[PDB]
Amino acid sequence: MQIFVKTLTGKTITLEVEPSDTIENVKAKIQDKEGIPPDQQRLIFAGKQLEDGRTLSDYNIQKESTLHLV
Numbered sequence: 001m002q003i004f005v006k007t008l009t010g011k012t013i014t015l016e017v018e019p020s021d022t023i024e025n026v027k028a029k030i031q032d033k034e035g036i037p038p039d040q041q042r043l044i045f046a047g048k049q050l051e052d053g054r055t056l057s058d059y060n061i062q063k064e065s066t067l068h069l070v
């Protein structure tokens with residue numbers, strides 16, 4: 001499936017993922033896209049701070065959903 005991530009510069013990046021992908025997996029994809037080390041990444045979805053060990057599905061993150069990097 002596909003989700004979007006807003007960077008600290010307002011840039012929108014597109015990620016191909018799956019419902020079971022963990023937030024840690026997503027941070028690795030963001031690192032590849034933008035070069036940001038995972039430990040410097042903090043993600044938010046619908047006002048929820050996302051934990052590395054939980055999955056997109058766990059957070060109700062759907063197709064075409066947008067996540068925020070802070």
Ligand SMILES: [Zn+2]
Pocket residue numbers: 018
């Ligand atoms: Zn798979």
Ligand SMILES: [Zn+2]
Pocket residue numbers: 017018021025
């Ligand atoms: Zn995956």
Ligand SMILES: [Zn+2]
Pocket residue numbers: 006068
């Ligand atoms: Zn926003």
